[PDB]
Design an enzyme around this catalytic site. Structure first.
Site, PDB file in Angstrom:
ATOM      1  N   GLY A 114     -27.646  32.759  10.765  1.00  0.00           N
ATOM      2  CA  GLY A 114     -26.313  32.548  10.209  1.00  0.00           C
ATOM      3  C   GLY A 114     -26.187  31.257   9.421  1.00  0.00           C
ATOM      4  N   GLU A 115     -25.014  30.575   9.560  1.00  0.00           N
ATOM      5  CA  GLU A 115     -24.626  29.295   8.938  1.00  0.00           C
ATOM      6  C   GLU A 115     -23.407  28.726   9.639  1.00  0.00           C
ATOM      7  OE1 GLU A 115     -24.497  30.099   4.657  1.00  0.00           O
ATOM      8  OE2 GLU A 115     -26.665  30.348   4.978  1.00  0.00           O
ATOM      9  N   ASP A 120     -32.506  28.626  24.739  1.00  0.00           N
ATOM     10  CA  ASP A 120     -32.791  27.628  23.710  1.00  0.00           C
ATOM     11  C   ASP A 120     -32.288  26.234  24.139  1.00  0.00           C
ATOM     12  OD1 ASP A 120     -33.853  26.996  21.079  1.00  0.00           O
ATOM     13  OD2 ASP A 120     -31.879  27.209  20.117  1.00  0.00           O
ATOM     14  N   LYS A 151     -18.663  29.408  12.124  1.00  0.00           N
ATOM     15  CA  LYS A 151     -20.010  30.000  12.045  1.00  0.00           C
ATOM     16  C   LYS A 151     -19.908  31.408  11.454  1.00  0.00           C
ATOM     17  CE  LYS A 151     -24.460  30.379  14.341  1.00  0.00           C
ATOM     18  NZ  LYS A 151     -25.248  30.077  15.569  1.00  0.00           N
ATOM     19  N   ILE A 176     -22.654  22.183   8.192  1.00  0.00           N
ATOM     20  CA  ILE A 176     -23.098  21.196   9.169  1.00  0.00           C
ATOM     21  C   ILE A 176     -24.551  21.370   9.622  1.00  0.00           C
ATOM     22  CG2 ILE A 176     -20.842  20.143   9.666  1.00  0.00           C
ATOM     23  CD1 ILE A 176     -20.440  21.846  12.177  1.00  0.00           C
ATOM     24  N   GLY A 177     -24.986  22.619   9.774  1.00  0.00           N
ATOM     25  CA  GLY A 177     -26.339  22.900  10.245  1.00  0.00           C
ATOM     26  C   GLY A 177     -27.068  24.134   9.752  1.00  0.00           C
ATOM     27  N   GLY A 178     -26.323  25.145   9.302  1.00  0.00           N
ATOM     28  CA  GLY A 178     -26.883  26.392   8.792  1.00  0.00           C
ATOM     29  C   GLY A 178     -27.338  27.377   9.848  1.00  0.00           C
TER      30      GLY A 178
END
Ligand SMILES: COc1cc2ncnc(Nc3cccc(O)c3)c2cc1OC
EC number: 2.7.11.1
Length: 287
Positions: free
Chosen positions: A22-23, A130, A39, A19-21
């Site tokens: 860890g990962e 973040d 994840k 989904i987005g990428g």
């Protein structure tokens, strides 16, 4: 990719897609039959962050605006966490808007929900560090489609000890997050505090309502910080509601050690809504 498509984790979570990428992957739970978020972190990785992400996610169970913890595991090739899959992120929803702006109704109601998430992570002893639109997503179920969820604890840091004492700031703390919503303190490579996550919320809400921030085109980290420091923040509030001057004045007065006044900020959103006839049961712009 750590995990190829169709790989099955602990004979239960089958990989559908990255989904987005860890990962981060969307997976099929072979037991409960629903799709989940999975994840992973390579077991060889030098700086191991998912162990901390799991701790944060576990301490937040019960609070609204967090994914349900499903499972976690460690192995010879990778470490993993399984959690409730969410839907549409706030960055994609804003770019989908015809003017790239949300109405003040959507902006204010998202503001309330994000602030509750921010107070929640701070109440368990962590800073997010973040805060940005792409780290918030709406639900994907009839019971959650109007709830906003806080995502990605990869940059989080514990600001306390076991007794709730505020830990000492480092003399220099290299800022790791995203440039656009970073506070001036973060740009100065100073130890971030609770007020720095509130600075990010403030820049997010200005962007939601106005559709842009003055430093949006600048890619150089140092240049953005220099513009922010000199920029008259009152000028950002030109088309924003009047009470946001209280939000801005309060956060500008805070330092690393000082607990923020979350109720002052929440009143700023609640009074801005009430003085405009905005109701909680209202439809969001994408609806
Ligand atoms: C459908 O899109 C997404 C859905 C998501 N659903 C749940 N958690 C996410 N991220 C998450 C939540 C908590 C900790 C963490 O490290 C990461 C998601 C991210 C997505 O976008 C990548």
């Amino acid at each position: 990719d750590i995990l190829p498509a169709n790989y099955v984790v602990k004979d239960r979570w089958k990989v559908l897609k990255k989904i987005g990428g860890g990962e981060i992957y969307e997976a099929m739970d072979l037991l409960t039959r629903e799709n989940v978020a999975l994840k992973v972190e390579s077991a060889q990785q030098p700086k191991q962050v998912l162990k901390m992400e799991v701790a944060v996610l576990k301490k937040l169970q019960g609070k609204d605006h967090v994914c349900r913890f499903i499972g976690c595991g460690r192995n010879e090739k990778f470490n993993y966490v399984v959690m409730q899959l969410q839907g549409r992120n706030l960055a994609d929803l804003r770019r989908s808007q015809p003017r790239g702006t949300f109405t003040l109704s959507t902006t204010l109601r998202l503001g309330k929900q994000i602030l509750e998430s921010i107070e929640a992570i701070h109440s368990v002893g962590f800073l997010h560090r973040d805060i940005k639109p792409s780290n918030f997503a709406m639900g994907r179920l009839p019971s959650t489609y109007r709830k906003c969820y806080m995502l990605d604890f990869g940059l989080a840091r514990q600001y306390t000890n076991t007794t709730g004492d505020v830990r000492p700031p480092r003399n220099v703390a290299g800022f790791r997050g995203t440039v656009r919503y970073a506070s001036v303190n973060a740009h100065k490579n100073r130890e971030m505090g609770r007020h720095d996550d509130l600075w990010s919320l403030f820049y997010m809400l200005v962007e939601f309502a106005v559709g842009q921030l003055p430093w949006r085109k600048i890619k150089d980290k140092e240049q953005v910080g220099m513009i922010k420091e000199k920029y008259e923040h009152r000028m950002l509030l030109k088309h924003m509601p009047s009470e946001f001057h209280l939000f801005l004045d309060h956060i500008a007065s805070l330092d690393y050690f000082t607990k923020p006044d979350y109720q002052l900020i929440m009143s700023v959103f609640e009074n801005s809504m009430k003085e405009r006839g905005i109701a909680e049961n209202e439809a969001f712009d994408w609806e």
